[PDB]
Structures are given as structure tokens and as C-alpha cells.
Design a binder for this molecule. Structure first.
Ligand code: ZN
Ligand code: ZN
Ligand code: ZN
Lengths: 67, 45, 48, 127, 1114
């Protein structure tokens, strides 16, 4: 669904970086590797949380019961 | 109160009981019960 | 052998047959209907 | 009897025949048979036509439900007059002591006319 | 982007699956049934007639499904997701047009409703055909759904691709103790189901059939077909200068015994001992009953006058008998893949429909003349008034044969069951991997593991790594990723085509010379006897590649005998391969770059002659090359893409080539169970039991296969940080250790939804059901049982339920079956309660409850519960490579180890699997995964390729870590370093089903069955477990003789029988009731299951008299 508010293995928060990591891709077309190092995710246990996050919340919402 | 709603018309229907099972404004025949107002008590873990 | 009442060879073909209790052949209610799914053992005993 | 079982096994094909045709749902055919069953014992089926009593018996079950079905939709398949099958309906109801009965409410018939009439998709404002 | 034809032939595999998807075999079969294969039915059952009043005729001119001819719009149809929430069938009506004899004048009336055909999803007759995520969002249906399955009255089912042996062809057989047989089954499409045998009794050829009362030796049945001169027999069967004249020489002198010698006398010996079918007239000539006995036999070929072509087809059938007796190495197996005919849905639903359709218009025939046997009722009588009574046997025939998957036919009189299954919405590819599978026939060779095994003639036809285990171990198989099932075209023009290319004819060639040359075999029948085949076959393909003949042909040409084969029968396998002309291929990468521009698709490749379809039989002659670096100047048919030998459900394994071979058949059986996501509409649907995961993630080491079915668009499971090592001894036998702090952050919190439903039933006496609720007591409406039941009777959406706590209240009347009394006297209180109680050992919440009505106006209720849970120990995890594991312990974070940076592993698995399981994939998947995180790019693990190792340690040494991924880390119990090095990195651990929240069972003293008075089998039936016969012998080996009595009558089956002493047999409370004195009785106790044996054994005339002693005073 939506990005998990904390990392699974270490514990730091990743909820304020999903919109940032995308905004570092729409404008200023940039590598996926060098984006989330500038953003502040050093070790390799936080970088899997945003590399591999499938975001199914944008496709579930189009089936809302309110027309 | 805030009774039954429709599927895609999404119009709040308070049908009198043992009369009908359709909705107005649209011919659709599926009526979803809307959520209560009553408080419900969860944990946060 | 002889010396018992039922020791004749006359009692080895059906002339009377007994009917079992209904504890053996119980009328199981499947409740797919208000009708009873009667087992196959009584409907043979009625066609006799 | 075996002949009395065989005269309703045949008479069960008749009620399921017309109910498949007029889209009568299955909770009326089974409700219709007891009206045929009490009229069977009380000497009402003798003499009259087999296919003329079962549609008159079915209309009793369709009136009690208060459904949109008329009386002439039974007769037009049978290609007889309305007044032929209607006359043996009157000799059923007063003979077999049917006192309570729904009235032919005409407000039922408006809602069913529109769907096979193929009118516009704003079919609620016409209703 | 300098493209080249060395590593970019992959880029035409998307050009295959774009125009021509993965459910080809289901969609293109029903779509051929609806369009064309209905009009070939009514054209074979037209002109219903009556014999009384012979000037009446009704004829069916044409038939259509869907739209009328008056309005001619698309349709208005109940949508598919609107149709599965009401237990209705998703169907479209059959329309016909008719003209008939009303009376004075005939009349032609259009659009007569005779039934409603069910139509499968994403076909061109349903509303989902070519929608664009806006029409399909309105219909709240998933874009990524495969389609291809009926939604008959609720449940959604799928016809499976059956297969059997090849009809209309022969197979040779051998046996030691039985001689040899020659089965040759033939099924012409009209009533005919006949197989013939060519058997050998003690050195003599015969020919038996199940319409001939005895067997006939073959020298009769070839003089019966004209081949009479008795030198022509041996000249056809044997040949010359051989030992075949010596084996066959016995059958020649049986013409001298029976003394027939001529073609006129040859016939009547057959029909003298034919089993005469009851003709009801019996015009039997004793001359024509034998001339038709050479027509109802071997129904491949029919004759006009000469009987000739049928004769030397029997002669070729009996030549391979003699060659099999010369050496039994020449025999054939019925498990070779060339001898299997796959058959689809729409060419099998047509065997059902024409059974139903002829059963329609012969009940509709006898309903006419039951009225037309009247003097008055013959002028104004019209026939379309009584058509609708018979229409209901078409709909109810089709819907009953899809739900209960057994098809009761009449024309072949055969009762295949199990032909439909309910599709499983456990996971995404659990419902897509079912759509491409094969259900075999189990021809009762249960002793032989031949067909249980796998044949080498299967490379890329259908998948090799997906096959179940256990009860079904080799009879269930799956299509591969590149596969097309052929279709039969026609055999008249190609028989006219082969005469042009220079073949002679069967009616001119001398029989001395047909064994010297080869022979063209058309569907197993010799017609031409070509000479120099290799100029003939190579000129044939140049008509096929350039496109004069259709492409679904095979020019198999063996050399064990002197024969070349053609096959156009359809319903057999094939795959495409690019033609290689000589020591340079036809790859032509200017064509391949023009493909990516988008005007030159894959279909135009075979239109030119760059690629064609080869089946398994046309791979006998060809010499497929693997890679472009392997071209020989004798080398054809370069293999297009080598990882296409694995289907879409085995394809998600990363690095399959490194891994062991039984560790790929252990993952396909569990990839269909891993929880995850299902579809986009998954919060809208109401299904029986639907598992969900909260936060899934796409994998790190992808595959090309998972991006060609869009698996990672909705994945299943998430990738942990595995630190493979032994830890605290709770990881011994492939169990594993995860930490408590990662579970609380949301590592693997599933969610379980479960439908339940009721129906408010309308009775015979006009009485409904009612949903009154919340009876009160002492100033408060809710009881303990009604805190979540709401005002209207239906339980309230949004709040929890516990054990107890009615959530659908329901009352059912007490005059449920009494006759309707036509009055109004006593009907005010007749409703007894029958509610629905939430059982279960945990509190779950109510997600959504809807109420609606079904097809007939009888209301529905469908409430859907909801609970989520957390993975405590017992919950079974996996690895995507086939290493199961019970969660063994949940330790805290601070006891887990940590590297230099503070990364605590999520899951620890022991090192003691990799030597026995030989899974080098997980050792590579961890290296190709860690290097992808540090570089920010996802990496591919494909089959027969993938991301290499030496270019992946170069990334892993720049970032600062070890070159083999094997980092060093501290310990959290003791503080200091570990004396070894730990293999550390991220591995994708998908979570499976089979959790322990719904497997803990506990029965103390509960329900008991009625006929046996034992505990009730079934966890849902409140359990009690079976102490069998394998476990009874284990007890007596200890010598223990008191709990054996306690475990098998005290805690199970105790019962107190009082039995009489003399004439000893049991009676009731105090009687004997056969010596009526009630005096000699002993109280004892025996098992109940010996009280009921002693009455079953007594019910048939056997009397088990009991004889008693007392225990004491030896
Ligand atoms: Zn982290
Ligand atoms: Zn509405
Ligand atoms: Zn006694």
C-alpha cells in the first residue's frame, strides 16, 4: 500500500521521503542510485524500503464507492 | 441514522422495511450498509 | 452336527428373514429439505 | 394411489411448463400445487380440460403474491378466449371457499411495462 | 544503442505476447465456437418435421449470439463483477431466425429466444473486450486479470485443457504373456466410436472388433476388399528377399482351409458371423451386409465402389505387426508427445451443445403433434407460442454441466467428470498458473511409472519444472511460455497439391515397387508413393514459408521404414523457430530494428518466411542450434530464446540454472500458496476466503519472465535481510529466527477475509423470513450477544465481534410445510429463532455487509468479516527457492547481532541446508541483491543467463564491503566479534499459507457420530483423532496391555451390554426376549462397535452365541 512509516530492520522513519524521492525524479531527471543518497539514506537496509516499494494506493483509490 | 447507500449512484436510501430492495435515482439493485457513528476502541500496535 | 434345535439343514435357505433395528440403519436427516434422506437399506427391505 | 401419484407427476409438468414460459419464479409453482392438490380431492378436475384448470389454479397463486401478471397472458398461449378461462376461474373461487384475496391494483402494472417497452435510459421519471 | 542480432533476439518475444497473449488456448477456442461452429450445428439439425399433417415444416436458417437484427446495437448486459455479487450466471442469449408454416401462408419470424449462452471473460462477445482502464474502472474489474472463466451462479470456474491419445491413427504394441495387439481407434463425428484390433494367436494374424462375434484372419478381409490373387497379399505385406515371407507364410494356407479363393465368396464369410444390429426391418441381402461390413470398420477411409484404398491400409496395418514379431525393438510407446492430441474448451463445449440442441427439437417436435392430433386445432394453430417451455433445458443444461463438472452425453455415451475446477484466488499467479495446465486421462496403467516420468521430447513444448507431487505426481503438467496449439484446416486441397509436385497415385503403382520407394502418408493413409522425397519435401516448405499453404503442418520423415508423413489434424502442439538457410541464418537485424519502430510485428515475420511453427514430430528431422555462435554449415532452425522452456509460474525463480533440479519442482507447488496481492478491485469483491498482505514489495533480483506477465506490478512477499548462521539452537531442521522489533514495524502482517451468507426463503404458504433483533432487558437494548447487531437486524459494519455475539439475526416460521389455509385466523406469532453465531478463537471485525437480490426475487445477505494478525511462531515462511521453515523463536532486537553500521538482520537461517539442498541460487541471489541496493538499480536473474558474478563483485568492492558479500559483524549477547565471518545480505522471503491460528485443535469430549458412536472426523466437525491400525501394532510391541484396552474402548467407544448366559445373545434393559424368563443375565461392558457387529452379523442368518466364564477360581 503506502510507504511504511519506519524501516523494518534498523528503525528510522521513512514517511517524509516518498514524495521527495519522486520529486527528485519528475523534475531533474536523476539516477535512482544517486537520488536517495543525497536524500539521507546511507546504509543498505533503508534503501530497499524505497527501491522496492510497490505503491498500490494510487490504483485502489480509483474504485471509490462515491462516483 | 444514515441508512443504506447505493453501489455506484451512492445515494443514501432509508427504505421502509418489507417494501422494496432497489434504489431511487438509478435502477441498480445492490445496497451497501453505511458505517455506524458509534465509537470503536482499537489499540495501536 | 445334530443335538441343537437349529442343526437341521432346512434352515440354510430363506424362509423367514429378520429385520434389523433402526439403530443400524438410521434415518439420517440431511436437512437439504423438510424431507428425509432415507438410506438405501430400508428401501431394499420395502421392495422385498 | 399409484394412479393418483401418476396423475400429479403429469400435472407437475404442466405447472412447470407455463412457469418457465412466463418467467414465473420457482416459489410460486410450489405454492400453486397445494391449490391444485385440494382442488384435486374435491372433484373439481373431473370433466374439465386438464390444461384449462392448471392456469386458473396458477393465477390464484399469482394474485396472492401481488405480481404484475395479468390473466390474458395465460390464455394467449392457449389460444382460447379470455372469457373461457375466466369462467372456470369464477367456479373455482366461490366453490372452494377462497374468501380473502388481493385486489387487482393497477399501480403494479406501470413499473413492469417500461422494461420491455425499450424507452429512454431515464426510465425513472416516466415512472 | 547500437543494436545487433546476437543478444537482441529477445526483443521479438514481447512482439509475440503483445498480439498473441498467454490465454491464447482458451480465448481463441470459444471465439471460434461462437462465430462459426454454431452455424455448422443448425445446418446439421435443420428441418424439424411432422408425419401427421405433412404440409408443416419449420427450418432454422441462421443463428446468432448477442445482438438482434432490429435494434442491432452492441448490447445491455449485466456486468461481470455486478454478476458475481448476486449468485447469477454471466451469460448472453442465443438468437435464431425461423420460417414455418402457420396456415394459409408461411411466415418468417426473426429473433426467437431459445436460451442463454454463458460467455467467458475478455472474449469479444463480453463488455470487457478492448477497454482502456476507464470503461474497466467503471465496471470495477481488474486490468491485470487474465480472463477466460465463467461466473456461473457465484463461483468462477474454468474448463481445463484435456488431452488423450491421437484418434484416427494406429499404435503398435508388445506384450510377452499376451501376444501383441494393434489398437486403432477411429471416431468419425456421427455416432461412431469404434476401435479395431489386429491380434496374433499362437503365430497367426487375426482381426477382431466389438461388433463381430468372433475374430477373422486377415487373408479373408483382404480378398473381401478385392486383393484376391494371394500373391498380391504377400507382395503387399512382406516385400522381397526377407524373413517376412517366413513369418507370414502360415496365414496363406487358411485360404485353402476355408476354400474361398475369390472376391465374391470372400464377403459372406464375414457377415455369417457378424453380430446383427436390430434394424427393425432386416432387409439383409446376405450380399450387402458384408459390403457394409467393409464400411463400418476403420472409419478413417470410406469407399465408393472399388474397396481398394481400404485394402492396402489394412495391409500397412498388418506389416507393422510382422515387423514387431521380427524384433520387439520396433514397437512404439503411447507416451511420446507426438501421440497426444490437446483439445481446448470451445471445441469441447460444442460436443455438449449439440447434445442439448437435438434434445431441444425432439421434445419440441412431440409437443406439436400432441396438439396437431385434433380436428379443430389444425388451422389457426401457431407453433412459436409453445417454444419457451422447451427453452429452459438449454440454459439449465449448460449451467449444470459447468458447476458440477461432469458431462452426461448421449452420442458417445461417456461420462467425463472433473472437467471444471474453481480457480484459486490465493495469489496472483495461483490464478494465472491454473489457466495454463493439462489434466490427463489416467488410462489405468497405475503400475507403470513410464507415463509418470518425463520425456526428452518436451523441450519448450510445455513446461518442464512445474509438476505436482504426492497423489498427483506426473499426470498434471503445465504449458510453457512459448506455445501454440494448432487448428485443422482441410485435407482436400493438399491432396490435390501433392499430385502437382510429382507424386504418382495409389491406383497405378505396382505393389512390387511400393516398398522400394518411400510413401506419403496423409493422416496415416498412403496415397501417393513418392520417389526421391528430399526434393519433394524441400519444395513443400518453400510453399509454406512463402505462404501458399497454411503454416500448421508437419513434414516429419522417418527412415526406420520407407515413408514420409504429413499431418494437418489440428489440436496438437507447436512452437515457433526461425529458419536457418545455411551457414548464415535469416536473422537480418535490419528487420529486427524495424520491429522496434513498431510497423514490423511478429506476425509479418512469418508472412515473409523468417520464422515458422514446428511441432514435436517436425523436430525429428531438424537440427536446432542453441546460439548464433554455434552455426554449422549443416545446421537449421536457430533457437529463438532459450529461457522460454519455463512457464509464467516457474519463471519467477532467480538463477534457475545454478539451482538443483528437484528444488524447482518444490517451488511451483508453493508459489501458488504465497500470500500477497490479488487484483486492483480486491477491496470491492466478496469472496469465500481471501488472504492479503499489508505492505508487499517487489523483489530485488527480478526476471524477464516476471515483467512479461506484470508480476511485480502487484507482488507477493517482501525481501528480508538474511544473515545465514546458526543461532541459539532454535534453527536446526530448516527452521529460522526473526526478531521482535521488525515484526512490530510491520514485517509480514497478513489479513484474512471470509464471506458468509444467508438466503431469506419464501415458502408455500406465503410466509417470509424476518430480521427482527435486539431484544431488551433492564433499561438496555443490547444483550452480551447483541452488542454488534445494529438496529435493523444486520450486524453493524465497523465494530468487532467475539465468540458468541449473533451478527445476523434470523427467524424461520414454524408452519414450514403445512398446507395454505385460505383464511386469516391465527397468524401473529410463529417465528422461531435460528441466528448465525460467530465461532472462532479470536475476535475479528466486520468489514462490510451488503444486501441485494438474486436473479429470481429472493433476497441475499453477504457479510464479510475481517481480521489481521502478526506472525508468531508456527507461521510457515519460505525462500522462493524451495526451503520451507517453521518460525522457531522470536527474540528481541538487542540479542540479534549487528554490523559496523547498526544493521540488525531481519531473519537468521541456519547454514546446514546448502550442502544437502545444493541451492547455489540463494548464495547468488544474495550477492546480486546486495549489489543492487548499493547501486540503486534492480538486477535480473533470468534462466540460462542473467547478471554475471564477476561484474557484480566490482560494484561490491567499490562501496566498501567484501568482494564475496561476506561481511563481519559483532554479537548482541556477549559484545565481542565472532570468530568467523557471516554471509550477510537481503533475500526475498515470501510468506506462505498454512498458519497455526487455524490449525490448533483441541477436543476433550464432544459430538459423536450416530451409526458408530465414535468421535466425529473433521476439525470443522469438532475433531477427535484416529488411532489407526499402523499405530495399534506399535503399542503391542511394547507389551503394554492396559492402555490398549483404555485407548480403544474407554476413551473412545464404551457401552454397557447385558447379555444372557445360556442361548447367549444380548438383550435390552432387563430382558433376553428369546427365552422370555429374564433370569440368566450378566452385566458386562464391550465396545459399541462390537454391539453393532453382533447385530449386523445377526441380521443375515449368522448367530454368534456367547459363552461365558468367570474370572476367578482357575
Ligand atoms: Zn534501515
Ligand atoms: Zn441509485
Ligand atoms: Zn437367553
Amino acid at each position: 500500500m503506502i510507504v511504511p512509516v519506519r524501516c523494518f530492520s534498523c528503525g528510522k522513519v521513512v514517511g517524509d521521503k516518498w514524495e521527495s524521492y519522486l520529486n527528485l525524479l519528475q523534475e531533474d531527471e536523476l539516477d535512482e542510485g544517486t537520488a536517495l543518497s543525497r536524500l539521507g539514506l546511507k546504509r543498505y537496509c533503508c534503501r530497499r524500503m524505497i527501491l522496492t516499494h510497490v505503491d498500490l494506493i494510487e490504483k485502489f483509490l480509483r474504485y471509490n464507492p462515491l462516483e | 441514522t444514515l441508512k443504506y447507500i447505493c453501489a455506484e449512484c451512492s445515494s443514501k436510501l432509508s427504505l421502509s422495511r418489507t417494501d422494496a430492495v432497489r434504489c431511487k435515482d438509478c435502477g441498480h439493485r445492490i445496497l451497501l450498509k453505511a458505517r455506524t457513528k458509534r465509537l470503536v476502541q482499537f489499540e495501536a500496535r | 452336527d445334530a443335538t441343537v434345535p437349529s442343526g437341521r439343514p432346512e434352515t440354510y435357505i430363506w424362509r423367514y428373514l429378520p429385520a434389523p433395528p433402526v439403530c443400524i440403519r438410521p434415518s439420517v436427516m440431511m436437512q437439504d429439505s423438510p424431507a428425509s434422506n432415507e438410506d438405501d437399506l430400508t428401501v431394499k427391505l420395502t421392495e422385498i | 394411489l399409484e394412479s393418483r401419484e401418476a396423475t400429479l407427476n403429469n400435472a407437475r409438468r404442466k405447472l412447470r411448463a407455463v412457469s418457465y414460459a412466463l418467467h414465473i419464479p420457482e416459489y410460486i409453482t410450489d405454492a400453486a400445487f397445494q391449490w391444485y392438490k385440494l382442488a384435486l380431492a374435491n372433484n373439481f378436475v373431473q370433466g374439465r380440460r386438464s390444461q384449462n384448470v392448471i392456469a386458473s389454479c396458477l393465477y390464484v397463486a399469482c394474485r396472492k403474491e401481488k405480481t404484475h401478471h395479468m390473466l390474458i397472458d395465460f390464455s394467449s398461449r392457449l389460444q382460447v378466449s379470455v372469457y373461457s378461462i375466466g369462467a372456470t376461474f369464477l367456479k373455482m373461487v366461490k366453490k372452494l371457499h377462497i374468501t380473502e384475496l388481493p385486489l387487482a391494483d393497477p399501480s403494479l402494472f406501470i413499473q413492469h411495462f417500461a422494461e420491455k417497452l425499450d424507452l429512454a435510459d431515464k426510465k425513472i421519471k416516466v415512472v | 544503442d547500437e543494436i545487433n542480432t546476437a543478444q537482441d533476439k529477445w526483443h521479438l518475444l514481447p512482439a509475440f505476447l503483445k498480439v498473441k497473449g498467454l490465454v491464447k488456448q482458451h480465448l481463441d477456442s470459444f471465439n471460434y465456437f461462437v462465430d462459426t461452429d454454431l452455424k455448422k450445428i443448425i445446418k446439421a439439425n435443420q428441418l424439424i418435421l411432422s408425419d401427421v399433417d405433412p404440409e408443416f415444416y419449420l427450418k432454422y436458417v441462421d443463428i446468432r449470439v448477442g445482438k438482434k437484427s432490429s435494434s442491432s446495437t452492441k448490447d445491455y448486459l449485466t456486468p461481470p463483477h455486478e454478476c458475481r455479487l448476486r449468485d447469477m450466471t454471466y451469460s448472453a442469449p442465443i438468437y435464431v431466425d425461423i420460417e414455418y408454416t402457420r396456415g394459409r401462408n408461411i411466415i418468417m419470424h426473426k429473433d426467437v429466444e431459445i436460451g442463454r449462452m454463458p460467455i467467458m471473460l475478455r472474449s469479444n462477445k463480453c463488455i470487457l473486450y478492448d477497454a482502456d482502464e476507464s470503461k474497466m474502472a467503471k465496471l470495477n474489474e481488474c486490468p491485470l486479470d487474465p480472463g477466460g472463466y465463467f461466473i456461473v451462479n457465484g463461483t468462477e470456474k474454468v474448463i481445463l485443457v484435456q488431452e488423450q491419445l491421437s484418434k484416427n491413427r494406429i499404435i503398435v504394441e508388445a506384450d510377452e504373456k499376451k501376444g501383441i495387439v494393434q489398437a486403432s481407434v477411429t471416431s468419425s463425428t456421427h455416432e461412431r466410436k469404434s476401435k479395431t484390433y489386429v491380434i496374433t494367436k499362437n503365430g497367426k494374424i487375426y482381426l477382431k472388433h466389438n461388433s463381430i462375434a468372433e475374430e477373422i484372419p486377415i487373408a479373408i478381409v483382404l480378398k473381401a476388399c478385392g486383393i484376391l490373387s494371394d500373391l498380391e497379399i504377400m507382395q503387399l505385406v512382406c516385400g522381397n528377399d526377407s524373413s517376412y515371407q517366413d513369418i507370414f507364410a502360415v496365414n496363406l494356407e487358411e485360404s485353402s482351409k476355408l476354400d474361398i479363393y475369390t472376391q465374391q465368396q470372400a464377403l459372406e464369410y464375414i457377415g455369417a458371423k457378424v453380430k446383427t444390429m436390430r434394424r427393425q426391418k432386416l432387409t439383409i441381402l446376405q450380399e450387402g451386409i458384408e459390403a457394409i461390413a467393409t464400411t463400418v470398420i476403420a472409419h478413417l477411409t470410406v469407399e465408393a465402389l472399388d474397396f481398394r484404398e481400404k485394402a492396402l491400409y489394412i495391409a500397412m496395418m498388418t506389416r507393422r505387426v510382422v515387423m514387431a514379431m521380427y524384433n520387439p525393438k520396433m514397437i512404439d510407446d503411447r507416451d511420446y508427445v507426438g501421440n497426444k492430441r490437446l483439445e481446448l474448451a470451445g471445441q469441447l463445449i460444442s460436443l455438449l451443445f449439440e447434445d442439448l440442441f437435438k434434445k431441444f427439437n425432439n421434445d419440441f417436435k412431440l409437443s406439436i403433434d400432441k396438439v396437431l392430433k385434433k380436428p379443430n386445432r389444425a388451422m389457426e394453430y401457431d407453433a412459436l407460442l409453445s417454444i419457451n417451455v422447451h427453452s429452459n433445458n438449454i440454459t439449465s443444461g449448460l449451467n449444470r454441466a459447468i458447476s458440477t463438472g461432469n458431462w452426461s452425453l448421449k452420442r458417445f455415451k461417456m461420462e467425463r467428470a472433473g472437467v471444471t475446477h474453481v480457480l484459486s484466488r490465493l495469489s496472483y499467479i495461483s490464478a494465472l498458473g491454473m489457466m495454463t495446465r493439462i489434466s490427463s486421462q489416467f488410462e489405468k496403467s497405475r503400475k507403470v511409472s513410464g507415463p509418470r516420468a518425463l520425456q526428452p521430447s518436451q523441450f519448450g513444448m510445455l513446461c518442464t519444472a512445474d509438476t505436482p507431487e504426492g497423489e498427483a505426481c506426473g499426470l498434471v503438467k503445465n504449458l510453457a511460455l512459448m506455445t501454440h496449439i494448432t487448428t485443422d484446416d482441410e485435407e482436400e486441397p493438399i491432396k490435390k497439391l501433392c499430385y502437382v509436385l510429382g507424386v504418382e497415385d495409389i491406383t497405378l503403382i505396382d505393389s512390387a515397387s511400393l516398398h522400394l520407394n518411400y510413401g506419403v502418408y496423409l493422416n496415416g493413409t498412403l496415397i501417393g508413393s513418392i520417389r526421391f522425397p528430399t526434393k519433394f519435401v524441400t519444395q513443400f516448405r518453400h510453399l509454406r514459408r512463402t505462404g501458399k499453404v497454411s503454416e500448421f503442418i508437419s513434414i516429419y520423415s522417418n527412415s526406420h521404414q520407407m515413408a514420409v508423413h504429413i499431418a494437418t489434424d489440428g489440436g496438437r502442439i507447436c512452437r515457433p523457430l526461425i529458419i536457418v538457410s545455411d551457414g548464415q541464418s535469416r536473422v537480418k537485424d535490419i528487420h529486427l530494428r524495424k520491429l522496434l519502430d513498431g510497423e514490423l510485428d511478429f506476425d509479418d515475420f512469418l508472412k515473409l518466411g523468417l520464422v515458422e511453427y514446428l511441432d514435436v514430430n517436425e523436430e525429428n528431422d531438424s537440427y536446432i542450434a542453441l546460439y548464433e555462435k554455434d552455426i554449422v554449415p549443416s545446421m537449421t532452425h536457430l533457437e529463438i530464446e532459450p529461457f522460454t522452456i519455463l512457464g509464467a509460474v516457474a519463471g519467477l525463480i532467480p538463477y534457475p540454472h545454478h539451482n538443483q533440479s528437484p528444488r524447482n519442482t518444490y517451488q511451483c507447488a508453493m508459489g501458488k500458496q504465497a500470500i500477497g496481492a490479488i487484483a486492483y478491485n480486491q477491496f470491492k469483491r466478496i469472496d469465500t476466503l481471501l488472504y492479503l498482505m499489508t505492505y508487499p514489495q517487489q523483489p530485488m533480483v527480478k526476471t524477464k519472465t516476471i515483467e512479461l506477465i506484470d508480476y511485480d506490478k502487484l507482488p507477493a512477499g517482501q525481501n528480508a535481510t538474511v544473515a545465514v548462521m546458526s543461532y541459539s539452537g532454535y534453527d536446526i531442521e530448516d527452521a529460522l529466527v526473526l526478531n521482535k522489533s521488525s515484526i512490530d514495524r510491520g514485517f509480514g502482517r497478513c489479513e484474512t477475509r471470509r464471506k458468509t451468507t444467508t438466503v431469506l426463503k419464501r415458502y408455500a404458504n406465503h410466509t417470509q423470513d424476518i430480521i427482527g433483533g435486539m431484544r431488551v432487558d433492564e433499561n438496555g437494548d443490547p444483550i452480551w450477544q447483541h452488542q454488534s447487531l445494529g438496529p435493523d437486524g444486520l450486524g453493524e459494519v465497523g465494530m468487532k465481534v467475539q465468540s458468541g455475539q449473533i451478527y445476523i439475526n434470523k427467524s424461520v416460521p414454524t408452519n414450514s410445510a403445512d398446507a395454505p389455509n385460505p383464511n386469516n385466523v391465527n397468524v401473529q406469532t410463529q417465528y422461531r429463532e435460528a441466528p448465525v453465531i460467530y465461532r472462532g478463537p479470536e475476535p475479528s471485525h466486520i468489514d462490510q455487509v451488503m444486501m441485494s437480490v438474486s436473479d429470481n426475487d429472493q433476497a441475499l445477505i453477504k457479510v464479510l468479516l475481517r481480521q489481521n494478525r502478526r506472525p508468531e511462531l508456527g507461521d510457515k515462511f519460505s525462500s522462493r527457492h524451495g526451503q520451507k521453515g517453521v518460525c522457531g523463536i522470536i527474540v528481541k532486537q538487542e540479542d540479534m547481532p549487528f554490523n559496523d553500521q547498526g544493521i540488525v538482520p531481519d531473519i537468521i537461517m541456519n547454514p546446514h541446508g546448502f550442502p544437502s539442498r545444493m541451492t547455489v541460487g540463494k548464495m547468488i541471489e544474495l550477492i546480486s541483491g546486495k549489489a543492487g541496493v548499493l547501486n540503486g538499480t534492480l538486477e535480473y536473474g533470468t534462466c540460462f543467463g542473467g547478471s554475471k558474478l564477476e561484474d557484480m563483485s566490482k560494484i561490491l568492492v567499490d562501496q566498501g564491503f567484501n568482494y564475496s558479500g561476506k561481511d563481519m559483524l559483532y554479537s548482541g549477547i556477549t559484545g565481542e566479534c565472532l570468530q568467523a565471518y557471516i554471509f550477510f545480505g537481503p533475500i526475498y522471503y515470501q510468506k506462505l499459507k498454512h498458519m497455526v491460528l487455524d490449525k490448533m485443535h483441541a477436543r476433550a469430549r464432544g459430538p459423536r457420530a450416530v451409526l458408530t458412536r465414535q468421535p466425529t472426523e473433521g476439525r470443522s466437525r469438532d475433531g477427535g483423532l484416529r488411532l489407526g491400525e499402523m499405530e495399534r501394532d506399535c503399542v503391542i510391541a511394547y507389551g503394554a496391555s492396559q492402555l490398549l484396552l483404555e485407548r480403544l474402548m474407554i476413551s473412545s467407544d464404551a457401552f454397557e451390554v447385558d447379555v444372557c448366559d445360556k442361548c447367549g445373545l444380548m438383550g435390552y434393559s432387563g430382558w433376553c426376549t428369546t427365552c422370555k424368563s429374564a433370569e440368566n443375565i450378566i452385566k458386562m461392558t464391550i465396545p459399541y462397535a462390537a454391539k453393532l457387529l453382533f447385530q449386523e452379523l445377526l441380521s443375515m442368518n449368522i448367530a454368534p452365541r456367547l459363552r461365558l466364564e468367570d474370572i476367578f477360581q482357575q
